Design a protein around this ligand. Sequence first.
Ligand SMILES: [Zn+2]
Lengths: 45, 28
Amino acid sequence: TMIYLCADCGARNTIQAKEVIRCRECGHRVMYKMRTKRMVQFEAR
Amino acid sequence: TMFPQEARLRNLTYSSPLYVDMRKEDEE
Ligand SMILES: [Zn+2]
């Protein structure tokens, strides 16, 4: 499974598939996703 | 309690509960 990030704290929640959506050392229950690596092809125009 | 707009996206409806004192008799 992967890592997720909370809306406020941002700490690594690294939480497991099929469980409960929340955090660890805090509160609130949302979370976005770390940006991939990832060297991405971008024209300057 | 709710904290919008951190709600919304949880498709949550933003209401509060009503509480009306009902009378049946036990004083309170
Ligand atoms: Zn958090």
